[PDB]
Motif scaffolding. Structure first.
Motif, PDB file in Angstrom:
ATOM      1  N   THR A 112      82.799 -34.344   9.996  1.00 38.21           N
ATOM      2  CA  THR A 112      83.495 -35.309   9.129  1.00 38.21           C
ATOM      3  C   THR A 112      82.548 -36.404   8.610  1.00 38.21           C
ATOM      4  O   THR A 112      81.614 -36.812   9.299  1.00 38.21           O
ATOM      5  CB  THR A 112      84.690 -35.969   9.862  1.00 38.21           C
ATOM      6  N   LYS A 113      82.788 -36.866   7.384  1.00 36.93           N
ATOM      7  CA  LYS A 113      81.936 -37.893   6.764  1.00 36.93           C
ATOM      8  C   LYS A 113      82.137 -39.279   7.405  1.00 36.93           C
ATOM      9  O   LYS A 113      83.247 -39.644   7.801  1.00 36.93           O
ATOM     10  CB  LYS A 113      82.207 -37.974   5.254  1.00 36.93           C
ATOM     11  N   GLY A 114      81.060 -40.054   7.480  1.00 36.36           N
ATOM     12  CA  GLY A 114      81.122 -41.392   8.062  1.00 36.36           C
ATOM     13  C   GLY A 114      80.211 -42.387   7.348  1.00 36.36           C
ATOM     14  O   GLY A 114      79.070 -42.068   7.022  1.00 36.36           O
ATOM     15  N   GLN A 115      80.715 -43.595   7.102  1.00 39.55           N
ATOM     16  CA  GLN A 115      79.925 -44.646   6.450  1.00 39.55           C
ATOM     17  C   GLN A 115      79.417 -45.685   7.466  1.00 39.55           C
ATOM     18  O   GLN A 115      79.945 -45.801   8.571  1.00 39.55           O
ATOM     19  CB  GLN A 115      80.749 -45.334   5.350  1.00 39.55           C
ATOM     20  N   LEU A 116      78.397 -46.442   7.068  1.00 45.72           N
ATOM     21  CA  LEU A 116      77.737 -47.417   7.945  1.00 45.72           C
ATOM     22  C   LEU A 116      77.277 -48.660   7.159  1.00 45.72           C
ATOM     23  O   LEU A 116      76.570 -48.542   6.165  1.00 45.72           O
ATOM     24  CB  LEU A 116      76.528 -46.751   8.626  1.00 45.72           C
ATOM     25  N   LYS A 117      77.677 -49.850   7.606  1.00 39.88           N
ATOM     26  CA  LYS A 117      77.247 -51.100   6.958  1.00 39.88           C
ATOM     27  C   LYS A 117      76.630 -52.071   7.977  1.00 39.88           C
ATOM     28  O   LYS A 117      77.171 -52.276   9.065  1.00 39.88           O
ATOM     29  CB  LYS A 117      78.424 -51.759   6.229  1.00 39.88           C
ATOM     30  N   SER A 118      75.500 -52.668   7.605  1.00 38.17           N
ATOM     31  CA  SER A 118      74.711 -53.515   8.518  1.00 38.17           C
ATOM     32  C   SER A 118      75.004 -55.009   8.308  1.00 38.17           C
ATOM     33  O   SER A 118      74.935 -55.510   7.183  1.00 38.17           O
ATOM     34  CB  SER A 118      73.215 -53.248   8.293  1.00 38.17           C
ATOM     35  N   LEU A 119      75.322 -55.720   9.392  1.00 33.62           N
ATOM     36  CA  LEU A 119      75.641 -57.157   9.322  1.00 33.62           C
ATOM     37  C   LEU A 119      74.980 -57.954  10.460  1.00 33.62           C
ATOM     38  O   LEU A 119      74.544 -57.387  11.464  1.00 33.62           O
ATOM     39  CB  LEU A 119      77.163 -57.371   9.381  1.00 33.62           C
ATOM     40  N   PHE A 120      74.926 -59.277  10.300  1.00 31.39           N
ATOM     41  CA  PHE A 120      74.437 -60.173  11.361  1.00 31.39           C
ATOM     42  C   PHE A 120      75.370 -61.391  11.506  1.00 31.39           C
ATOM     43  O   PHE A 120      75.692 -62.052  10.517  1.00 31.39           O
ATOM     44  CB  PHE A 120      73.001 -60.640  11.059  1.00 31.39           C
ATOM     45  N   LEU A 121      75.794 -61.687  12.736  1.00 33.77           N
ATOM     46  CA  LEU A 121      76.733 -62.792  13.000  1.00 33.77           C
ATOM     47  C   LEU A 121      76.123 -63.830  13.955  1.00 33.77           C
ATOM     48  O   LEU A 121      75.325 -63.484  14.828  1.00 33.77           O
ATOM     49  CB  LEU A 121      78.030 -62.238  13.608  1.00 33.77           C
ATOM     50  N   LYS A 122      76.502 -65.100  13.800  1.00 30.85           N
ATOM     51  CA  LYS A 122      76.037 -66.150  14.723  1.00 30.85           C
ATOM     52  C   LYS A 122      77.167 -67.109  15.123  1.00 30.85           C
ATOM     53  O   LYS A 122      78.122 -67.326  14.372  1.00 30.85           O
ATOM     54  CB  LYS A 122      74.871 -66.948  14.114  1.00 30.85           C
TER      55      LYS A 122
END
Length: 98
Positions: free
Chosen positions: A35-45
């Motif tokens: 199955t297809k899967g998406q990925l998004k990169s983030l940074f939190l503080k």
């Protein structure tokens, strides 16, 4: 039980409140299961500490801007970059509508 970034432990599914320090474009791959899967990169503080965020599938399409206040619910664990938070639910607190 609203968690802080310091309250995050490996294999903990919880919701935190933090600032978006960095917002990176989405990515689109295929899961090992086919199955297809998406990925998004983030940074939190936060005052208690900082963490690296990760959005999967449709969540990778979610609008998230640098400097915006967001409440992020996710599964935190040990592995990627030391400790990764696999986001389950994400929402921008400052949002509104007509």
């Amino acid at each position: 039980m609203n968690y802080k970034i310091s309250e995050l432990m490996p294999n903990l599914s919880g919701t935190i409140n933090a600032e978006v320090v960095a917002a990176y474009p989405k990515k689109e791959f295929s899961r090992k299961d086919g199955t297809k899967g998406q990925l998004k990169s983030l940074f939190l503080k936060d005052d208690t500490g900082s963490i690296r965020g990760t959005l999967w599938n449709e969540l990778a399409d979610f609008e998230v801007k640098k400097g915006d206040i967001a409440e992020v619910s996710g599964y935190v664990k040990q592995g990627y970059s030391g400790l990764e938070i696999s986001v389950d639910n994400i929402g921008i607190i400052e949002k509104s509508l007509e």
